[model samples]
Target: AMKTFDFTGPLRPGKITPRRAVPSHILRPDYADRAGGVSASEEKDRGSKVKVYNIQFLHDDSKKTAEIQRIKTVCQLSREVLDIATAAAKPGITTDELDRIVHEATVERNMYPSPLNYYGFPKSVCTSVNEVICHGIPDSRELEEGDILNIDVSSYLNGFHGDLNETVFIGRPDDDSVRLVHAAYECLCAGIGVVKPEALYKQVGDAIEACASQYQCSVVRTYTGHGVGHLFHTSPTVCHYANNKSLGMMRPGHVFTIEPMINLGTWQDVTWPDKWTSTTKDGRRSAQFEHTMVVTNGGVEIFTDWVDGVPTYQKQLKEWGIMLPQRK
Candidate 1:
């Protein structure tokens, strides 16, 4: 029966998980045990248009007040969940095990794992290893020593979503791997620093590309960032490479993400047979760092930034005499 289902090319086990059972105590959203559903009221948001980016959507006084609180709720929980998953991402631990940790952390807080069953996706969080650029599903494979992985986590709570991701080492990584990780982090910060009212959406990519060029890293062009709120993904496609034409202006009340996927090899990528697993075309290592931020009158406010965060690229930024543009 399994063979009749069209087994082809390289096999991806995550595509065939037989059963998915979450604890009854673990709450789900309307969409997947996920929803307040993207309500008709929410759907009316400017975000519904697939190609819209020129307009900056603002919240009313009461709406803004409520959204800020909701965004903070999920973002704080996402960080906590991300930290737990990161701590458990070690050699000998399986990606499936990491998913459990993330799942537990999310439901324990009465929140929903945003990716679970999303468009038939079978996992709670994304675990992209080494060459996998993003959306690598959690499976039973044990992480090997000296490996690196990117853990992407998002949480839906109180009608809003918080998104963030980081790439980390399994054990002791080689010098090149460490450098690649650092460059990706700087790319994230560079993209965020350029956000301000009336600025071109592509400027974020320019900053990312300029910083990545120093390390000879290539930025992934296929998957850019998007607006996040009541909906999982929305308007204003944010490209991560230089000279992209996804034009839009950042303005006060506009909230979106600036995740730059940087590769140590070619900028091109190839999707796995599963369709969700994206990897480098040359089979070389890749790294990514992401954050969700809101544009402010003066600059931008990163909802995901936290104290005690590791400064992997601060030294490199200082060495290059680069001063990060402040969000305030």
Candidate 2:
């Protein structure tokens, strides 16, 4: 059986810019450069071969259509935004600088940032710094040496959406940060390894939960992964706890994200008054990796893995995108 949260709060639809200061413990001791404009046009395949909505399903097709386009557009917006963020990352770079990069890329692509004002979130992108769980508000905080930051980027375009994020170490990282970041991403890969045609999706959660246990860490239950593609968040929520009720199969054309939020403490969470930012109940370091994927006849297709020079699973992202200077 599936459970649902009231998720009640003020809601806004469509593209909106965040006007509040991004809250973070650290402040920009130094000013940073604003983002440079993007090229006239970015080339993305958009992989329209499989139309989730156009199919004559046994049941409601509206949901599928909405989901497919949502994912495709999500890919379009997210990919370009990542390109911008990767370009912006550097030592001494402010969070606001990163946000501006995302904002420019999204608007220039003729897309809307789905996160802005959706539940009153203040920024176009989410910058979760070290010790800050998910929803780390982007603000004056500057990326410093060895800082581990996870930037979550989401966008609504072409009537659909896609979702994905990664944790990057600014300049150089300490030993612990290096291990944890890779562990978090591997947790995502661990979960993905379980997603098979005949497999129950819950197994993915089971896999993640097991992996966390091995790391002597906890997997966040309060926030599970979700279906993306159309309608920002939809059916068959992907839970990340052991024996989770999350059930489904890797049926070809099934598109959703499998992001596992890992915390160094308890699995509980608390949201800020903004009504969107979620943090660990106990202050601790947290990390996450997300990808909007489509199930295939053989396996799965990772939409966010596209780049002229980068593969999605590569350990380092800053080196993946078209070459640019390190944020420092």
Candidate 3:
């Protein structure tokens, strides 16, 4: 869930990480070049097999027959990478070690790890433990029993980027931790449930907030979801709180992410000394789930919907009393 928080009213503003150079040897797409513009020549270098979307926000293409299939491939590959990373999360294993595992699996598919060298981010994957809300860089800290982990993976293949994340229990989680992860899952589905052609963007956050409140959990306000495709993050900000001012309606062919970060304590979050690591203001646990999807003519099509053959987007909705938006 690499969605960034807003600049206003942050728990505490911190210094940004200094920019780092991308080595010539490392594989990167056109967007990686800071000074260079996205040109037809640079895009042509992507080769015959590559499928690239234009830089502008995706507009309605009716059925979006061609565009959907393009991102569908990359999204599935992203899920495959996440499946490999989460399967290795265990007690005593360091987060840094898991980073290597995800990195290798990603490149194996001839894809670039989106987070690596992304705005100077120093990791291939994000492993946010217990209290860390988001942007928790992979490190040497070892996973312990009862710890909750949110493994976020994004893969850039061809020209599209696939992004999604899940919260997993290291060992046996306590009752509170169990409830936290479950609520986070429910919130994600609730947010995704409101997505359909013409549905106001505000409904996504409304449903998420209502569900989290039921479990006595608070939705982290700072970081909301965003549009993702050729650009890692883009338009149609998906806020996860009620009465949010975010504009735009769900239109067919528009693709975006819904990542709700729920906290067990205060909704406010603070950045750690590392600058990227975000955690609960009260030091309580936070859990998050993310998925990138497109609004189809009638309903929604989730791209990053599966992890290790486990369905992350189509899980129990009515069982949780979540009502579905009618299909067009």
TM-score of each: 0.82, 0.72, 0.78
Model 1 residue pairs with clashes: 28-33, 29-33, 29-34, 29-35, 30-34, 30-35, 31-34
Model 1, range 1-328, lDDT digits (tens) per residue?
A: 3322322223244433532466675545556743323433335655555322222322332344467657756887798889888877889998888988898898888788888877667788999888888998888888887777889999888778899998887776776777788889989988988898888898889999988888888999999998887777777789999988976677776778888999989998877666688888877888998888777667787777654565433433455564543321
The TM-score obtained by model 2 is: 0.72
Best by TM-score: 1
What's model 2's lDDT at 256? 75
Candidate order (lDDT): 1, 3, 2
Query: How well is each residue in 1-328 modelled by candidate 2, as lDDT tens digits?
Result: 8544332222112233445332332221111112222211111213223234332331342453444444655585587788668657888988777888887777666666656554445677888776666776677766787777788888766556667788777776665565567668768888888775677888988898788776666788888777765455655578877988765565767777888988767877767554555766775667788888776666766777656634332435445442322211
Give the Å shift of residue 220 in candidate 2: 1.0
Error of 3 at 145 (Å): 0.2
For candidate 2, give the lDDT. 0.65
Worst 10 residues of 1 by lDDT: 51-60
